[PDB]
Amino acid sequence: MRVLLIAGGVSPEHEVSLLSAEGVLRHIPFPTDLAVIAQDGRWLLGEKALTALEAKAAPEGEHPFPPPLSWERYDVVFPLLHGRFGEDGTVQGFLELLGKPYVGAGVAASALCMDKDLSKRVLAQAGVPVVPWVAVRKGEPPVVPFDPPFFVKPANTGSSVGISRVERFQDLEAALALAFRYDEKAVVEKALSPVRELEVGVLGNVFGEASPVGEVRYEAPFYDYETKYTPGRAELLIPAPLDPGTQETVQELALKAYKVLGVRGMARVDFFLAEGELYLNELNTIPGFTPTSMYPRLFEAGGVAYPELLRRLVELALT
Amino acid sequence: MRVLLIAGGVSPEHEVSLLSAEGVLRHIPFPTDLAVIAQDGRWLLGEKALTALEAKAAPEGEHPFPPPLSWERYDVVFPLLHGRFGEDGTVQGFLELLGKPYVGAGVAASALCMDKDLSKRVLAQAGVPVVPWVAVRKGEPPVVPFDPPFFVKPANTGSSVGISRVERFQDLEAALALAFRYDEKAVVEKALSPVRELEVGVLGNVFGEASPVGEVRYEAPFYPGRAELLIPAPLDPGTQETVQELALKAYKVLGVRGMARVDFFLAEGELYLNELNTIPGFTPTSMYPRLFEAGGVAYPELLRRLVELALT
Ligand SMILES: Nc1ncnc2c1ncn2[C@@H]1O[C@H](COP(=O)(O)OP(=O)(O)O)[C@@H](O)[C@H]1O
Ligand SMILES: Nc1ncnc2c1ncn2[C@@H]1O[C@H](COP(=O)(O)OP(=O)(O)O)[C@@H](O)[C@H]1O
Ligand SMILES: [Mg+2]
Ligand SMILES: [Mg+2]
Ligand SMILES: [Mg+2]
Ligand SMILES: [Mg+2]
């Protein structure tokens, strides 16, 4: 058995991806090789991939896509790329054409879960509660269906990149410009405040099993990039201090969304809890995978050790 | 400016894909090379691609995927593949990773328009009419809230494969079994009967322009009847406009790029959007091209616009 782990990527989450790879590479219970996609899109293989991992960032790569990799040597490919060109169905599509089994969601589910506009449309249709929002296209005059404050974001982003809180309409233009640096489509959501952030892990193909629910607490105005990756800045409460009904509703909604979207392998489902009301914020098909990341910790609290979690992910990819 | 046209594919529409390629090569106003995906998945390049084209069918290819193709020699790629591994976002993903501009819908829009379950969920939430349906997952017995007749279909196999018209609930189990041999998810749609089928073309990136509306009609069988692409469709004034407006709304909501042939059902005065084809048939006599020609957009000009849109 041999697994190919791909990390890095051209998205803003390149460094976060390499961090996830470090954690996975240390506990994955299978012979595994690492391939790195540099920020310039060129791949780094073998020892150069390991050298990049140790550097924590690979600006330049050697091989133009597609890389001269002996794909036949791998039983499963574990795409550990976060964000566009990795978690959005693009890499998945390549793997489908290659006929290679891989970890995580397929093309449709990956593309849909990454889009903060379309995912909300599908979930709402299924009766899942979501935050009021509207999509805005670059070059299209914005007409927000509700008053501020808002959270403006690239429709496809991660690690809070390109996201900002907007208090007045006159500040919307600049917030959208920032979002458009990352995507041609942005979303403007009604800002919930105060808000509690709950996250739950799901494991399995389509019909999943839920981990305990966790909660994120911090002092910053919102769960931004520095708060997300600065160890100890955020507080992860596992399990989250929720009453039984709310805990169960979070887990049930997560499994429902997971099934409707047809997610395979895994997903960390994040929610907002405000004034006793729950909202499914987003599903993450390739959640941060450091041993300390939320998804791994969640399942650890659920009796599934890090090595065992990775084993199951690989096995699910083969069924 | 040099364009790369990819046609053929491993789907059942391999032959029609080559016919579309033939039509495109004949009128595309840019230097263009052809690459063919044989029915076995291997690629044929250079002269062998042209040989396959003239043969109208390429059973076996030479190069296993990914092919040793000089991508840098092309400014735009035109994936003229239909169905599975063509309109589902897979080839689009490969082209995205290659960093090559390409004609038509991107990964998300392609994958979504392909899925007869998810596309309906999106459209229904946006207020676009679609027929009543239920999504069914392999291994999980379905609960259909409406009565037969039904049209059971794999959710993402495409190419009319595995689609059955069911008239009795007792025949549902079998119909589903058939659909599930092609996809892990199927849909059970309320069958409209009688029903008329209308089609309209859209061109542009996200904010498109609609062509006139056409109707797919069949003539009486003799010793089944032929199918005419009647342009324009004989409809009341408001109806044509509604068809165009719904097509443009669906197009924008799904974020489609380049083009789409949007197919509708008309029954008892009610419209239902059945499908957005992101890579429609493209021969000189195909519905999409003829619709825009009726709209004042000549075939060569249509091809030019699709190539230019791919760059913006
Ligand atoms: N509608 C909202 N109301 C309140 N806070 C929000 C809202 N949307 C986003 N946020 C804040 O921004 C953070 C990131 O938003 P998110 O959509 O999860 O982007 P990302 O996919 O990068 O994690 C959230 O964890 C939350 O703290
Ligand atoms: N809900 C329905 N009611 C009536 N006829 C239908 C329905 N769904 C499909 N059909 C018939 O089957 C044909 C193909 O349906 P479609 O889903 O578009 O298959 P394909 O994926 O091959 O294009 C339609 O053109 C129509 O004649
Ligand atoms: Mg996310
Ligand atoms: Mg988040
Ligand atoms: Mg189709
Ligand atoms: Mg159709």
Side-chain angles (χ1 to χ4, degrees), chain B residues 6-19 21 34-63 81:
Chain B
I6 303 176
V10 300
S11 76
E13 302 172 85
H14 172 278
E15 293 100 318
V16 301
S17 173
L18 293 179
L19 286 173
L34 174 67
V36 170
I37 293 184
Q39 293 175 295
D40 64 359
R42 306 165 81 73
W43 297 48
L44 295 173
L45 315 174
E47 301 292 345
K48 292 186 182 179
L50 301 181
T51 297
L53 180 59
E54 77 179 3
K56 261 50 193 176
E60 305 171 1
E62 183 188 334
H63 307 290
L81 303 160

Coordinates of all heavy atoms in Angstrom, one line a residue, chain B residues 6-19 21 34-63 81:
Chain B
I6 N -10.5 19.8 -28.7 CA -10.5 18.5 -28.2 C -11.9 17.9 -28.4 O -12.9 18.4 -28.0 CB -10.1 18.4 -26.7 CG1 -8.8 19.1 -26.4 CG2 -10.0 16.9 -26.3 CD1 -8.4 19.1 -25.0
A7 N -11.9 16.7 -29.1 CA -13.2 16.1 -29.3 C -13.1 14.5 -29.2 O -12.0 14.0 -29.1 CB -13.7 16.4 -30.7
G8 N -14.2 13.9 -29.3 CA -14.3 12.4 -29.2 C -14.8 12.1 -27.8 O -16.0 12.3 -27.5
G9 N -13.9 11.6 -26.9 CA -14.3 11.3 -25.6 C -14.7 9.8 -25.4 O -14.9 9.1 -26.4
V10 N -14.8 9.4 -24.2 CA -15.2 8.0 -23.9 C -16.7 7.8 -23.6 O -17.1 6.6 -23.4 CB -14.4 7.5 -22.6 CG1 -12.9 7.6 -22.8 CG2 -14.9 8.4 -21.4
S11 N -17.5 8.8 -23.7 CA -18.9 8.7 -23.5 C -19.6 8.2 -24.8 O -19.0 8.1 -25.9 CB -19.5 10.1 -23.2 OG -19.6 10.9 -24.4
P12 N -20.9 7.8 -24.7 CA -21.6 7.3 -25.9 C -21.8 8.4 -27.0 O -22.1 8.0 -28.1 CB -23.0 6.9 -25.3 CG -22.6 6.5 -23.9 CD -21.7 7.6 -23.5
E13 N -21.5 9.6 -26.7 CA -21.6 10.7 -27.7 C -20.3 11.0 -28.4 O -20.1 12.1 -29.0 CB -22.2 11.9 -27.0 CG -23.5 11.7 -26.4 CD -24.0 12.8 -25.5 OE1 -24.6 13.8 -26.1 OE2 -23.8 12.8 -24.3
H14 N -19.4 10.0 -28.3 CA -18.1 10.1 -29.0 C -18.2 10.5 -30.5 O -17.6 11.4 -31.0 CB -17.3 8.8 -28.8 CG -16.1 8.7 -29.6 ND1 -16.0 8.4 -30.9 CD2 -14.8 8.9 -29.2 CE1 -14.8 8.4 -31.3 NE2 -14.0 8.7 -30.3
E15 N -19.1 9.8 -31.2 CA -19.3 10.1 -32.6 C -19.9 11.4 -32.9 O -19.4 12.1 -33.8 CB -20.1 9.0 -33.2 CG -19.5 7.6 -33.3 CD -19.9 6.7 -32.2 OE1 -20.1 7.1 -31.0 OE2 -20.1 5.5 -32.5
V16 N -20.9 11.9 -32.2 CA -21.5 13.2 -32.4 C -20.5 14.3 -32.0 O -20.5 15.3 -32.6 CB -22.8 13.4 -31.6 CG1 -23.8 12.3 -32.0 CG2 -22.5 13.3 -30.1
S17 N -19.6 14.0 -31.1 CA -18.6 14.9 -30.7 C -17.7 15.2 -31.9 O -17.3 16.4 -32.2 CB -17.7 14.4 -29.5 OG -16.6 15.2 -29.2
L18 N -17.3 14.1 -32.6 CA -16.4 14.3 -33.8 C -17.1 15.1 -34.9 O -16.5 15.8 -35.6 CB -16.0 12.9 -34.3 CG -15.0 12.1 -33.3 CD1 -14.7 10.8 -33.9 CD2 -13.8 12.9 -33.1
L19 N -18.4 14.9 -35.0 CA -19.2 15.6 -36.0 C -19.2 17.1 -35.6 O -19.2 17.9 -36.5 CB -20.6 15.1 -36.1 CG -20.8 13.7 -36.8 CD1 -22.2 13.2 -36.6 CD2 -20.4 13.8 -38.2
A21 N -16.9 18.6 -34.0 CA -15.5 19.0 -34.3 C -15.4 19.4 -35.8 O -14.8 20.4 -36.1 CB -14.5 18.0 -33.9
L34 N -6.4 19.9 -33.9 CA -7.3 19.0 -33.2 C -6.6 17.9 -32.5 O -5.6 17.4 -32.9 CB -8.2 18.3 -34.3 CG -9.2 17.2 -33.8 CD1 -10.2 17.8 -32.9 CD2 -9.8 16.5 -35.0
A35 N -7.2 17.5 -31.3 CA -6.7 16.4 -30.5 C -7.9 15.6 -30.3 O -9.0 16.1 -30.0 CB -6.2 17.0 -29.2
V36 N -7.8 14.3 -30.4 CA -8.9 13.4 -30.2 C -8.7 12.4 -29.0 O -7.7 11.8 -28.8 CB -9.2 12.6 -31.5 CG1 -10.2 11.5 -31.2 CG2 -9.7 13.5 -32.6
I37 N -9.8 12.2 -28.2 CA -9.8 11.3 -27.1 C -10.5 10.1 -27.7 O -11.7 10.1 -28.0 CB -10.5 11.8 -25.9 CG1 -9.8 13.0 -25.3 CG2 -10.7 10.7 -24.9 CD1 -10.4 13.5 -24.0
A38 N -9.8 8.9 -27.8 CA -10.4 7.7 -28.4 C -11.3 7.1 -27.3 O -11.3 7.5 -26.2 CB -9.3 6.7 -28.7
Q39 N -12.2 6.2 -27.8 CA -13.2 5.6 -26.9 C -12.5 4.8 -25.8 O -13.2 4.5 -24.8 CB -14.1 4.7 -27.8 CG -15.0 5.5 -28.7 CD -15.8 4.6 -29.6 OE1 -15.2 3.8 -30.5 NE2 -17.1 4.6 -29.5
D40 N -11.2 4.5 -25.9 CA -10.6 3.7 -24.8 C -9.9 4.7 -23.9 O -9.1 4.3 -23.0 CB -9.6 2.7 -25.4 CG -8.5 3.3 -26.2 OD1 -8.4 4.5 -26.3 OD2 -7.6 2.5 -26.6
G41 N -10.1 6.0 -24.1 CA -9.4 7.0 -23.2 C -8.1 7.5 -23.6 O -7.6 8.5 -23.0
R42 N -7.4 6.8 -24.5 CA -6.1 7.2 -25.0 C -6.2 8.3 -26.0 O -7.2 8.3 -26.8 CB -5.3 6.0 -25.5 CG -5.2 4.9 -24.5 CD -4.8 3.6 -25.2 NE -3.4 3.5 -25.4 CZ -2.5 3.3 -24.4 NH1 -3.0 3.1 -23.1 NH2 -1.2 3.2 -24.6
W43 N -5.3 9.2 -26.1 CA -5.3 10.3 -27.0 C -4.6 10.1 -28.3 O -3.6 9.3 -28.4 CB -4.7 11.6 -26.4 CG -5.5 12.1 -25.2 CD1 -6.0 11.3 -24.1 CD2 -5.9 13.4 -24.9 NE1 -6.6 12.2 -23.2 CE2 -6.6 13.4 -23.7 CE3 -5.7 14.6 -25.6 CZ2 -7.1 14.6 -23.1 CZ3 -6.3 15.8 -25.1 CH2 -6.9 15.8 -23.8
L44 N -5.1 10.8 -29.4 CA -4.5 10.7 -30.7 C -4.2 12.2 -31.0 O -5.1 13.1 -30.9 CB -5.6 10.2 -31.7 CG -6.0 8.7 -31.5 CD1 -7.1 8.3 -32.4 CD2 -4.7 7.8 -31.7
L45 N -3.0 12.5 -31.4 CA -2.6 13.8 -31.8 C -2.1 13.9 -33.2 O -2.0 13.0 -33.9 CB -1.4 14.2 -30.8 CG -1.5 13.9 -29.4 CD1 -0.2 14.3 -28.7 CD2 -2.7 14.7 -28.7
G46 N -1.8 15.2 -33.6 CA -1.3 15.4 -35.0 C -2.2 14.9 -36.1 O -3.4 15.0 -36.1
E47 N -1.5 14.2 -37.0 CA -2.2 13.6 -38.2 C -3.2 12.5 -37.8 O -4.2 12.3 -38.5 CB -1.2 13.1 -39.2 CG -0.3 14.2 -39.7 CD -1.0 15.3 -40.6 OE1 -2.1 15.0 -41.0 OE2 -0.4 16.3 -40.8
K48 N -2.9 11.8 -36.8 CA -3.7 10.7 -36.4 C -5.1 11.2 -35.9 O -6.1 10.5 -35.9 CB -3.0 9.8 -35.2 CG -1.8 9.1 -35.7 CD -1.3 8.2 -34.7 CE 0.0 7.4 -35.1 NZ 0.5 6.6 -34.1
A49 N -5.1 12.4 -35.4 CA -6.3 13.0 -34.9 C -7.2 13.3 -36.1 O -8.5 13.0 -36.0 CB -6.1 14.3 -34.1
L50 N -6.6 13.8 -37.2 CA -7.4 14.1 -38.4 C -7.9 12.8 -39.0 O -8.9 12.8 -39.7 CB -6.5 14.9 -39.3 CG -6.0 16.2 -38.7 CD1 -5.2 16.9 -39.8 CD2 -7.2 17.1 -38.3
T51 N -7.1 11.7 -38.9 CA -7.4 10.4 -39.5 C -8.7 9.9 -38.7 O -9.6 9.4 -39.3 CB -6.3 9.4 -39.3 OG1 -5.1 9.9 -40.1 CG2 -6.7 8.1 -39.8
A52 N -8.6 10.1 -37.4 CA -9.8 9.6 -36.6 C -11.0 10.4 -36.9 O -12.1 9.9 -37.0 CB -9.4 9.8 -35.1
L53 N -10.8 11.7 -37.2 CA -12.0 12.6 -37.5 C -12.6 12.1 -38.8 O -13.8 12.0 -38.9 CB -11.5 14.0 -37.7 CG -12.6 15.0 -38.1 CD1 -13.7 15.0 -37.0 CD2 -12.0 16.4 -38.3
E54 N -11.8 11.8 -39.8 CA -12.3 11.4 -41.1 C -13.0 10.0 -41.0 O -13.9 9.6 -41.7 CB -11.2 11.3 -42.2 CG -10.3 10.1 -42.1 CD -9.3 10.1 -43.2 OE1 -9.2 11.1 -44.0 OE2 -8.5 9.1 -43.3
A55 N -12.5 9.2 -40.0 CA -13.1 7.9 -39.8 C -14.4 8.0 -39.0 O -15.1 7.0 -38.9 CB -12.1 7.0 -39.0
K56 N -14.6 9.2 -38.4 CA -15.8 9.5 -37.6 C -15.9 8.7 -36.3 O -16.9 8.8 -35.6 CB -17.1 9.3 -38.5 CG -17.7 10.6 -39.1 CD -16.6 11.4 -39.8 CE -17.1 12.8 -40.1 NZ -16.0 13.6 -40.6
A57 N -14.9 8.0 -36.0 CA -14.9 7.2 -34.8 C -13.5 6.7 -34.5 O -12.8 6.2 -35.4 CB -15.8 6.0 -34.9
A58 N -13.0 6.9 -33.3 CA -11.7 6.5 -32.9 C -11.7 5.5 -31.7 O -11.7 5.9 -30.6 CB -10.8 7.7 -32.5
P59 N -11.8 4.2 -32.1 CA -11.9 3.1 -31.0 C -10.7 3.1 -30.1 O -10.9 3.0 -28.9 CB -12.0 1.9 -31.9 CG -12.7 2.3 -33.1 CD -12.0 3.6 -33.4
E60 N -9.5 3.2 -30.6 CA -8.3 3.1 -29.8 C -7.4 4.3 -30.0 O -7.2 4.8 -31.1 CB -7.5 1.9 -30.1 CG -8.4 0.6 -30.0 CD -7.7 -0.6 -30.5 OE1 -6.5 -0.5 -31.0 OE2 -8.3 -1.7 -30.5
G61 N -6.9 4.8 -28.9 CA -6.0 6.0 -28.9 C -4.5 5.5 -28.8 O -4.2 4.3 -28.7
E62 N -3.6 6.5 -28.8 CA -2.2 6.2 -28.7 C -1.6 6.5 -27.3 O -1.0 5.7 -26.7 CB -1.4 6.9 -29.8 CG 0.1 6.6 -29.8 CD 0.9 7.5 -30.7 OE1 0.3 8.0 -31.7 OE2 2.1 7.7 -30.5
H63 N -1.8 7.8 -26.9 CA -1.3 8.3 -25.7 C -2.2 8.2 -24.4 O -3.3 8.8 -24.4 CB -0.8 9.7 -25.9 CG 0.1 9.9 -27.0 ND1 1.4 9.5 -27.0 CD2 -0.1 10.5 -28.2 CE1 2.0 9.8 -28.2 NE2 1.1 10.5 -28.9
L81 N -16.4 18.1 -25.9 CA -16.7 16.7 -25.5 C -18.1 16.8 -24.8 O -18.4 17.7 -24.1 CB -15.6 16.3 -24.5 CG -14.2 16.3 -25.0 CD1 -13.2 16.3 -23.8 CD2 -14.0 15.1 -25.9

